[PDB]
Amino acid sequence: RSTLVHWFRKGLRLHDNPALSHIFTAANAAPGRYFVRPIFILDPGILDWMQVGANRWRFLQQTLEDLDNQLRKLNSRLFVVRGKPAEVFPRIFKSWRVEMLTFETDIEPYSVTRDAAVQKLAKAEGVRVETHCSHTIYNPELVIAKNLGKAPITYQKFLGIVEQLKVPKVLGVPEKLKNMPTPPKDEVEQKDSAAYDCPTMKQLVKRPEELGPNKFPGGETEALRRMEESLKDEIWVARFEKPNTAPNSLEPSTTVLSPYLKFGCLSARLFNQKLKEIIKRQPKHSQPPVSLIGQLMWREFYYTVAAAEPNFDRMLGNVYCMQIPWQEHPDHLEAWTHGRTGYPFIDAIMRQLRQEGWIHHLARHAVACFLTRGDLWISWEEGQRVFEQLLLDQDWALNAGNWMWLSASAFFHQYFRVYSPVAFGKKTDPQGHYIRKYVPELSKYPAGCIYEPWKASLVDQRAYGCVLGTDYPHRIVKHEVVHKENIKRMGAAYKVNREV
Ligand SMILES: Cc1cc2nc3c(=O)[nH]c(=O)nc-3n(C[C@H](O)[C@H](O)[C@H](O)COP(=O)(O)OP(=O)(O)OC[C@H]3O[C@@H](n4cnc5c(N)ncnc54)[C@H](O)[C@@H]3O)c2cc1C
């Protein structure tokens, strides 16, 4: 008896999962011949390549638990195999007599390299590998091909390419396993009945004092519930316009499906299909890029340019990226990183991020503009690394592509438009309720100066119980001075890049 193995990496879901559905159908169309191991590999190697914060570790723990639970409802289970894939797969290929391996493809450089070596081992041991592109709606390879070998570098060009492509068929959940016994314990399972159980919170979260509120539980079950909840107000959905959603509402002004889509707890293909059913139903609706479907197409757009550039996450060697002489300022980066810049709007956002692991799109704009071309002149790579640690939705292609946009390094070139750290939040939160919540030391400042507490006299700062420089920091820079200097620095950078 041989084993069929689905390998979860992303695509942490049962629904709309071709790689996993094929495994299950094959076992049911040939009962008695196959064992089935749906596995996730706790790969130590990814930690040398990315940072993971407490909150995102928790989301993954919750996700793996839900996936295991969902697999049990189909007379299977999740097997979580600790160790490096290059060492794990040769062992289990023999210990399990694996006939077929399926998995969902990924475009990240670490994933491509890792998958290539696995596919080399699978070819040696005579193991059939079947891969499926279901993490995105469109296959970046086909988009690049249709555009004659280059990725469209504008959203509009990208749209006009994918409009001519076939939308994939969205699958349901796989059928339950018919008369399948629990696979026999292998070398590891015999010395430890739990060697493959889902990790506990204690095993994955080493810094539990950094966990913030549990607001967005992981897992496919929670993904689908949140999408169904977001789709309930069809008018909100149909008339959604991303630029008009607030960054500093107390409740999220968008769906917060990003962590679920990042891990594949939610299929973007299913989400796209559910959105298209509401739009059909609602003749007055928005259109890309501002619509909700347009938001999914921004995800597709960045996955496609990212697939073409292995150095997408860095300035050097990145075909898309303007070369800009960012400066090193460790003390300013620490301040921004920990939300101690002295600009309350900025600090509010960075604390919401650290505490909760999600911030609104235009809140990311504000803190990203501040760090890079706006105020501090620190490389977007540094903002990417902090975002990578803290975001539940950390996504290699999106975190890069958007940082490049916000820094005016690619895709976006109107660097003379600069967000004000004082005025920008006021439009949608003139009372500063957001600031009061995430910077409570200022909670007694009246709206007139909660965004600019240095305009309160010393007497009033003592009266509000927050003296700048003691209870809340002084501004680390003066926006009115540095942003003008940085515009000139950007112009010079753009001239050098144009002459080369
Ligand atoms: C500096 C910076 C860094 C970012 N890093 C990430 C990241 O690491 N991971 C991430 O998922 N998004 C990232 N984004 C994009 C965007 O801000 C988030 O996708 C969005 O805030 C998710 O919130 P939401 O799910 O409520 O989005 P909604 O507006 O409800 O959109 C639905 C989905 O569309 C996609 N989407 C929406 N906006 C964008 C966008 N601008 N680019 C790409 N896809 C988009 C996401 O999958 C999102 O879940 C970043 C943006 C900026 C400016």
Domain boundaries along the sequence of the chain: 1-134, 136-169+219-308, 330-499
Asked if residue 267 belongs to a known ligand binding site, the reply is no
Q: Whose CA is nearest to atom 17 of ligand 1?
A: 361
Reported CATH class of domain 330-499: mainly alpha
Q: Return the closest-CA partner of residue 478 out of 409, 418, 421.
A: 421
Residue 340: both structure tokens together: 């101690």
For residues 282 and 238, the answer to whether their CB atoms sit within 8 Å is: yes
Please count the residues of the chain: 500
CA 258–ligand 1 middle distance (angstroms): 6
Give the angle subtended at the CA of 15 by the CAs of 59 and 25, to the nearest 5°: 130
| CB-based contact 137:272 (threshold 8 Å) | yes
| Residue 292, token pair as written in the block | 């909700």
Please answer whether residues 134 and 16 qualify as being in contact, where contact means their C-beta atoms are separated by less than 8 angstroms: yes
The CA–CA distances, whole Å, from 379 to 27, 368, 382, 410, 420 equal 51, 10, 6, 13, 19
Q: For residues 467 and 473, what is the distance between their CA atoms, to the nearest angstrom?
A: 9
Please tell me the experimental approach by which this structure was elucidated: X-ray
Q: How far is CA 478 from the centre of its chain?
A: 32
For 337-363, letters b (16+ CB in 10 Å) and e give: bebbbbbbbbbbbbbbbbbbbbbbbbb
Q: Which among 51, 244, 299, 372 is the best mutation to test ligand 1's pocket, defined by most ligand atoms within 8 Å of the CB? A: 299
Q: What is the resolution of this structure in A?
A: 1.9
For residue 169, the one-letter residue type is K
Q: Confirm whether residue 302 is marked as ligand binding.
A: yes
* CATH topology assigned to domain 1-134: Rossmann fold (3.40.50)
Query: What's the one-letter identity of residue 186?
Result: D
C-alpha 361 to ligand 1 mean position (Å): 6
Residue 294 alpha carbon to ligand 1 centre in Å: 11
Shortest-distance Cα residue to atom 3 of ligand 1: 399
Residue that the structure tokens 């079950």 belong to: 221
Phi, psi of 258 (to 5 degrees): -60, -40
Residue with tokens 């929670």: 222
Q: Which atom of ligand 1 is nearest to the CA of 252?
A: 26
User: What's the token pair of residue 71?
Assistant: 């697999």
Ligand 1 center to 39 CA (angstroms):
28
**Ligand 1 center–CA 192 separation, angstroms:** 41
* Count of alpha carbons within 13 angstroms of residue 85, beta-carbon side: 22
Cβ count near 128 (within 10 Å): 12
Quote the ligand 1 centre to 392 CA distance (angstroms). 11
Three-state DSSP string of the chain: CEEEEEEECCCCCCCCCHHHHHHHHHHHCCCCCEEEEEEEEECHHHHHCCCCCHHHHHHHHHHHHHHHHHHHCCCCCCEEEECCHHHHHHHHHHHCCEEEEEEECCCCHHHHHHHHHHHHHHHHCCCEEEEECCCCCCCHHHHHHHCCCCCCCCHHHHHHHHCCCCCCCCCCCCCCCCCCCCCCCCHHHHCCCCCCCCCCHHHHCCCHHHCCCCCCCCCHHHHHHHHHHHCCCHHHHHCCCHHHCCCCCCCCCCCCCHHHHHHCCCCHHHHHHHHHHHHHHCCCCCCCCCCHHHHHHHHHHHHHHHHCCCCCCCCCCCCCCCCCCCCCCHHHHHHHHCCCCCCHHHHHHHHHHHHHCCCCHHHHHHHHHHHHHHCCCCCHHHHHHHHHHHCCCCCHHHHHHHHHHHCCCCCCCCCCCCCCCCCCHHHCCCCCHHHHHHCHHHCCCCHHHHCCHHHCCHHHHHHCCCCECCCECCCCCCHHHHHHHHHHHHHHHHHHHHHC
Separation of alpha carbons 339 and 367, rounded Å: 10
299 is in an annotated binding site: yes
Question: Which residues, judged by CB distance below 6 Å to any ligand atom, belong to the binding site of ligand 1?
Answer: 242, 252, 254-258, 261-262, 295-296, 298-299, 302, 360-361, 364-365, 368, 387, 391, 393-395, 398-399, 402-403, 406
- CATH architecture observed for domain 136-169+219-308: Alpha Horseshoe (1.25)
Closest residue CA from atom 37 of ligand 1: 295
